[PDB]
Design a protein around this ligand. Structure first.
Ligand SMILES: [Zn+2]
Ligand SMILES: [Zn+2]
Ligand SMILES: [Zn+2]
Ligand SMILES: [Zn+2]
Lengths: 582, 582
């Protein structure tokens, strides 16, 4: 029948985002007073103790309890040094608190109840470290308590329940000589012998650990009282009466009270609210949803990941490079690398869509990358100042130009799709080969005053298989990929987007027995004309004597290497001997 | 035979851009010492005096004359207050100088020669105010000089010429008792009676005014010497000998020396070097040349001014508004006005081409304008936060929404071409009408997941004449202008550029007997599709019962006005009664 009284944690903590926000606002503008409003009626069957709710309001003075709520005073100790937090005497700290509670408990037994929070806020990473502590002292530590049940007294319990509901500041009450509930009074309990406590535990037959606190005070006030009646009053059905007696197993005061973290261990609790409060992450979120939402409502069969995870390499941060990098981004592409040897000129900003008047004179390639990051910070934008040697062009400073060759491979390599966005035919050679020899997909964008050309090579022909423009062609036609960068503006815009939309269609699985995907066709070549507003799709087979993808040529580069390039670059006729046009 | 000696200005000033630059560098980091190197041999037949060349080097100590050059010490007085400059005693200042020269002249006759510059630099406007002053004193003022020619003595002249060439620091020489050229010596000239001066004037028979300076010293050194021989030595053929005699027409010292400005008046000289040094103007220059150069080499028959001088009004600073304003700029368009009621959202920057992560939350319309100005500072970019009410949409707050209506007219009015770049059909009505009622050209851009539509109205039909998409159409087709802003990115890019290239072709004079200009066609409607990479041009006649351009409708708006709109907006069926679809 008998037993020793065991307890349960007084409270469970619930810190709302608003709490942590307020916490931060204050760190950017010691000890801090808090105040909660306990609701000992609204307790989920699922929990074991009164839930402690902390929000940005707990910090304030003017809180506003509702009928039947019990206001509870508390505090928070914030630390700037994460080490200080970690290296604190968790034990000593709770003990220093328990001493303050004990000091007030001997003045008003109803004031030995309080909570405390230790914390460290990592405002940059939005990580928050905190530990809730409820001062629970037992003095003397030797004194335990033997108890025996007593058949319920719903009459007495209810009586006490109403009393505590009304007296929202009291945690203990007793009976006077007329058997009526009255405030705790040492000399009166000494005789009446019945102590009633407002339990914050639901644990069946196990009172809150705050019980130890009051008992410590009781003992101090009535050394002799060794036998009595304990009533654990709960604002529900669990209220139970007990036949107490004070024992003593061999002034020593033990203190407990730290809250077990999520995992169940006795250590701090950490919460990462970056996904919620980090604008930069909330930003990254939306960019994502735009596509997921787009897919979901109009094209569930769209593969977004592939596009997102493609590492694009843009050769040229000029007019085309900008509009292209612009369209890629908007598709989700997160890895983009710019390769341009020049710098931003006065006449660039209005045409090349990633520059401002202020960045004139500065290195172009590395600035475009910087510009994507302003638009979208998470972007993996990189700029490399390297030079692509042209065919039929006296090698200048062979050493350094050689490095530019090796360095250009390292790049055509670490990437998935290569965008060839240069001015002239002569500057497409070296890179197209390197990209073929590296088994990479190449998309080409060429500009003409009126027209443009977009195409791919992953067998289909490459740019250099067959000529594009004939001699007997139009004047405004022959300006195609002819070092003609300044054209009717709109040309680069279309050429760009089509070049990107082709890369995204081509990146989707093709329907067996057909040349299409969920996004439409996957043409080989696209040709546009502004004076008539038209587009044409043409396909062309690999040519046997092409100076770029011909077996003999690839062979040559494979066998000799740079010696071949160097020679080819300075002497174009040479390539024609190798290919077989001769 | 006789006459009175007249003079000519000692020097002519030439301030090189480098001078003014150095001048500035110093103002951003009193009196300043200058030093020039006169070249009295290299004198253009066209000039009247030795040219004084000032550059950024004049400021320096280590200048480096060339053989036969005469170093001349000078100074500059700079002013920060333009008023101080203006309100200075030009007369007193030159006189205070002449006094210093006179002080050194009596110590070494060869040191009474110097120049001075007063200036005010307007570094922001690149305007420079300066006045060159050459201290020329005549003392006493009463003493003039009667002179009579003397048959050349090329022997004597040459003798003196060599002497001055060698003695680059001397301005005067004389003959000793052995009839040999020697440095000036008061007691020696008192007897030898021949004074030779290094003339800096080419003026036939008129010596430099610096002559007065030496004569002033001569008089002071030899009060008695009343008759003598003056030799005006020029480093060429004009050297002439004179029979002098000192007169006196009734110590008073008059001072002259200020340089006549470009116009010939005796005031400061002002030079505006903004077109040269203003990066912002040099910038504006290039943007200009790009097109002039483009026209010149590929299309001399292109009218650029028209495009440049068009005041474009963009309704919507979303995805379309950005790419469009982007293409316009690059064509030269300098007046662009953005009209958008919303603000920049997290998911915007990657799609809407004129925004950065940093400007999220801020008012969209006014920010796009700000963004064009960063790209190109001279742009006349304006942003207006106004709202375009939708058809079939419960009027909300009639008053303010009314203003938004009146204010939208003021704009569709002060502009030349109107770009309709909104999300839905419902938001194109009010503006399309207003733009028709205002006789303005309207270009429309509609977005669909896969497609887009661009068209114009200046009789051809308007957007609302005939339906665009049918019900029995494709799923990915019916998303056209269906509040579908998030589509395959490239759509807005093409839709935009084509919309701008159409406006530029349509802005060029049409070849009589044909529907084309120097830039190509001028379609009514352009339709594009991404899944197949195609474009179509369709034309459609004005419809009799169109709810926007139908005679009955225009009539209605004309007759009633806002009362009509308000009613039409809230009740679409109404419009159909008016038009006649009923
Ligand atoms: Zn008492
Ligand atoms: Zn080939
Ligand atoms: Zn002497
Ligand atoms: Zn119509």
């Amino acid at each position: 029948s008998e037993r020793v009284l065991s307890y349960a944690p007084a409270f469970k903590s619930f810190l709302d985002t608003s709490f942590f926000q307020e916490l931060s606002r204050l760190k950017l503008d010691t000890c801090q007073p808090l105040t909660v409003n306990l609701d000992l009626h609204n307790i989920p069957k699922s929990a074991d103790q009164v839930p402690l709710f902390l929000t940005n309001r707990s910090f304030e003075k003017h809180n506003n309890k509702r009928t039947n709520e019990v206001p509870l005073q508390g505090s928070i100790f914030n630390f700037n040094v994460l080490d200080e937090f970690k290296n604190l005497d968790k034990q000593l700290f709770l003990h220093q608190r328990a001493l303050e509670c004990w000091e007030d408990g001997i003045k008003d037994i109803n004031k030995c109840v309080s909570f405390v929070i230790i914390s460290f806020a990592d405002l940059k990473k939005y990580r928050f470290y905190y530990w809730l502590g409820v001062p629970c002292f037992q003095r003397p530590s030797s004194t335990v308590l033997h108890v025996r049940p007593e058949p319920s007294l719903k009459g007495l319990f209810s009586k006490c329940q109403k009393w505590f509901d009304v007296n929202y500041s009291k945690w203990v009450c007793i009976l006077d000589a007329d058997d009526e509930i009255v405030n705790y009074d040492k000399c009166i309990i000494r005789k009446t012998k019945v102590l009633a406590i407002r339990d914050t535990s639901t644990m069946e037959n196990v009172p809150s650990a705050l019980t130890k606190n009051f008992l410590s005070v009781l003992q101090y006030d009535v050394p002799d009282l060794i036998d009595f009646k304990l009533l654990i009053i709960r604002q529900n059905e669990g209220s139970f009466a007990l036949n107490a007696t004070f024992a003593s197993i061999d002034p020593d005061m033990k203190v407990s009270g730290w809250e077990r973290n999520v995992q169940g261990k006795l250590a701090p609790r950490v919460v990462d609210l970056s996904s919620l409060l980090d604008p930069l992450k909330i930003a990254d979120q939306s960019v994502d949803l735009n596509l997921k939402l787009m897919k979901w409502r109009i094209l569930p069969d769209l593969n977004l990941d592939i596009i997102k995870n493609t590492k694009v390499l843009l050769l040229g941060a000029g007019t085309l490079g900008c509009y292209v990098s612009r369209a890629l981004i908007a598709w989700g592409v997160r890895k983009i690398t710019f390769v341009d040897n020049g710098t931003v000129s006065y006449s660039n900003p209005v045409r090349q869509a990633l520059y401002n008047f202020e960045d004139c004179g500065k290195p172009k390639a590395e600035l475009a990358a910087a510009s994507l990051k302003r638009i979208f910070p998470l972007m993996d934008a990189t700029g490399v100042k390297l030079s692509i040697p042209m065919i039929g062009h006296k090698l200048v400073n062979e050493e350094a130009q050689h490095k530019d060759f090796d360095r250009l491979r390292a790049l055509i390599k670490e990437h998935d799709i290569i965008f060839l966005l240069v001015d002239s035919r002569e500057s497409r050679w070296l890179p197209s080969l390197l990209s073929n020899i590296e088994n990479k997909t190449v998309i080409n964008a060429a500009l003409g005053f009126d027209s443009y050309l977009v195409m791919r090579h992953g067998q289909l022909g490459c740019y250099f298989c067959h000529d594009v423009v004939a001699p007997t062609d139009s004047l405004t036609d022959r300006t195609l990929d002819q070092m003609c960068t300044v054209t009717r503006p709109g040309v680069a815009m279309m050429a760009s987007s089509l070049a990107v939309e082709l890369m995204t269609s081509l990146l989707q699985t093709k329907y067996s027995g057909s040349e299409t995907t969920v996004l439409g066709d996957i043409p080989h070549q696209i040709r546009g004309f502004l004076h008539n507003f038209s587009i044409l799709k043409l396909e062309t087979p690999a040519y046997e004597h092409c100076p770029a993808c011909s077996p003999k040529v690839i062979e040559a580069f494979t066998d000799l290497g740079w010696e071949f390039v160097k020679k080819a670059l300075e002497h174009p006729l040479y390539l024609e001997e190798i290919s077989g046009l001769s």
